[PDB]
Amino acid sequence: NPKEKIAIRVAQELKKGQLVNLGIGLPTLVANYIPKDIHVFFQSENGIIGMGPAPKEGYENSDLTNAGASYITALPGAMTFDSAFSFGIIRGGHLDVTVLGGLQVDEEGHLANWMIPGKMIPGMGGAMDLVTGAKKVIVAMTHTAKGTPKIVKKCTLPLTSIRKVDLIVTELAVIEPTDEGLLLKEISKETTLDEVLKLTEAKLIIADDLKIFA
Amino acid sequence: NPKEKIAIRVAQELKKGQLVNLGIGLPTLVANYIPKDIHVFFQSENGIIGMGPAPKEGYENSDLTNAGASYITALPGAMTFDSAFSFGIIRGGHLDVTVLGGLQVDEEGHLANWMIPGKMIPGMGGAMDLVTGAKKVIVAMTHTAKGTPKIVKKCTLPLTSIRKVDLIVTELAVIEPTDEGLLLKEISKETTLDEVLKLTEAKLIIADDLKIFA
Amino acid sequence: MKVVDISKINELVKEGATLMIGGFLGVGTPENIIDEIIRHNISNLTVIANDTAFEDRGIGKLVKNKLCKKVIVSHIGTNPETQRQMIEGTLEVELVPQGTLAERIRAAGVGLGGILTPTGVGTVVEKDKKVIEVEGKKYLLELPIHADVALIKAKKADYLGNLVYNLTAENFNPIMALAAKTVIAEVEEIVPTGTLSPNEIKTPGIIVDYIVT
Amino acid sequence: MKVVDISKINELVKEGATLMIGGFLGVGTPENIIDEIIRHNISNLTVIANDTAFEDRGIGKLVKNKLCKKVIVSHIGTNPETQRQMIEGTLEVELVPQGTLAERIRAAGVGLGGILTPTGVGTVVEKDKKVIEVEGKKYLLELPIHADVALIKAKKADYLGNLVYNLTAENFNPIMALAAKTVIAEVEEIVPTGTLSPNEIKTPGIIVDYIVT
């Protein structure tokens, strides 16, 4: 449900004909909630444009996977390619959207999502190229980590890059980083403005227009 | 005959299974003189490995040419490709031999072969990448520009590259640049060593081994 | 839709446009698109290409009609009308080594700020360039080359705009397609989706904005 | 003579070699070649790859057997044993952003001295990298990665050694084939010359030194 609420709301930000890259984990659920009427094309960093859902049993191909090595399908008109071409797409501004998961976001729009010192050290993979290169970065993340806020004044965990992400989506809030600060645009209807502010360390501008729907 | 004398001697330098790029003009005659027992692979900068001779009449393809836009064939096993890849093969040291024409070559091993000021300004095409990146550069050229020596102490016409070419073959001599200067290894059966030196402004080290050939 | 009428060129290519145009000495060049630019005197163009082809073909038809103010190429020797205009000073000509031209255009399409090449060190092409040493070898810093429109040629496109090229017609086309703000691809044939295999496609349709004939 | 028995690995892969190994989480990795390395316990390798795959697959098998002193990768988080050896100091783990790794290997293959990339600017990656401003933007200078041998996987080779790849097994393999001194390709099938078209081949046989099975 919390991951659902986030995934549904991210899925409404996607537009017809967009090339979209989804991070593994929470963002991949976005692909379950694309509206009919919206056709998008999915990129995976290991080298495909035209990724499709997991194969029906017995239709697997060991050479065809996502960026977690799980079996996927290729849709008609798919292209596969080497890792140089793949990051030419990502770093060269040809990717319209990337949805990525989040460890922290700060008031400059700065994302940390690839390392917790002491705890988890998996390496960055393609996450740095994706944030610095995508036309639009949407972070999809739960609002707190066991009550600790993830939206903070200055990122304390190592940065994925200095680019300002274009939108944050949590189960309680929709936040757009701007020229002068995080702009709260939307609130979930199971929550209240008061709770969102108790659960955010970072300063938020509040919009005159302030909408509901996660 | 001298253009044929040079081509035959250069073709003797080719080893089995090498990837070779012949420059337009004098060097392309090299192809007519390869032993019927040495198989080589020919590259053309416009994007082909496995170039072959011009097609018989009626067998032309509008999309298959050499670097002069002249119609060629492709042999079985050819690969065609884009210009980034093509110059990755050239610049990256995957080209075993280039045979190029020459305007001047000095005792540093430096070749001038793309421009004569106030006469030719055709631009440099691939010649700078080829001289810099080939495993071996063989300059194929007439010894003199109407009696004016072309092998000189130092180049006065613009440099194609600062890379030391590996072999110079003319109608009169075979010279190998070395760390100690130019080393004259061979002279034509139709000439004499005094005439070779007479027609060379640069200083030649004569080899103990000096051979008769071309 | 990506496929549009060729008469639409006058609308997408502006006077003063910076244009990349595919082709090697006219092989793999979008002749029909070039012919439309001539038909409508679209002028003061900056053309990035391998060459200016011949006087009667390809990009050379643009120089013959004096529609270029500047060309950024590696070779002009096959076109005496280019050299004539260069000598007379009406055409600015920037000569780039052909491998450096490929990499600088690719850098823009791929999001690099630049590449170091050994080609041209110690030649006239070193002039006005930053030099950077890496393990005691000199390289020139060469910078990305951007353009308003890529005018490219391809052999076939599928219904989604995926392209394949043919033999030595490929050359600069797939790299210019990544580097320009808008891509217009002349193609010979439109084929069904599923005719071009995922392993064969060389330009995805996502980067192609328009297709003619 | 390109095709050789798998035993020839031991003449070709020396102790302390620096190796590029293709494969994305073990997809398109040369598993048989890796198994021969483990059989002869060839060790103190420096391995350049996208990742250390998983504990029982592909490159992770080389780590399980402690055959690497160093890995240059972009990701190690599917392999706990890589992380455990990293934490103890036995294994040197250099982390590179995947896209920078692809361009650092490609730079070695195509003869560039380096590439400027905006990825990693302002992060831990910027440590000990020259920074270069171009038109008022910052880039990290990233330098070519060389190796003694590339161990790559492909779907097919023809009699001349030209290679094609299959779907997402392609990833780093054709890049690494250009970058190393010697190239050893594990392939699933040998097909006649003329089966693979000039328009389809991705790696020319001229750059492939040996083929296994």
Numbering used by the authors:
A (entry chain B), B (entry chain C): 2 to 215
C (entry chain D), D (entry chain A): 1 to 213
Question: How does the study describe this entry?
Answer:
CtfAB then transfers the CoA from acetoacetyl-CoA to acetate to reform an acetyl-CoA and produce acetoacetate. CtfAB is a member of family 1 CoA transferases. CtfB contains the acetyl-CoA binding site and the PS01724 signature sequence which includes the catalytic glutamate residue (E46) sandwiched between two short antiparallel beta strands on the N-terminal end of an eight-stranded mixed beta sheet. CtfA contains the acetate binding site and the PS01723 signature sequence.
Acetate molecules were identified in every CtfAB structure in the substrate-binding pocket directly adjacent to catalytic residue E46. Acetate 1, colored magenta, is the only location where acetate is bound in the same conformation in each structure. The conserved acetate-binding site in Wt-CtfAB is shown in Figure 4. L25 and F24 of CtfA form a hydrophobic pocket for the methyl group of acetate (301 A). The methyl group of acetate (301 A) is 3.9 Å from the CZ side chain carbon of F24 and 4.0 Å from the CD2 atom of L25. On the opposite side of the binding site, one of the polar oxygens is in good hydrogen bonding distance (2.5 Å) to the side chain NE of CtfA Q98 and 3.4 Å to the side chain ND2 of CtfA N50. The second polar oxygen of acetate is 3.0 Å from the OE2 side chain atom of the catalytic E46 residue. This oxygen is solvent exposed and connected to an extensive water-filled cavity. In T. mel CtfA, there is a contiguous hydrophobic patch between F24, L25, the methyl group of T78, and F54. This hydrophobic patch could provide both binding affinity for acetate and improved thermal stability. While it is clear from SEC and native-PAGE that multiple higher order oligomeric states of CtfAB do exist in solution, the heterotetramer is the highest-ordered state apparent in CtfAB crystals.
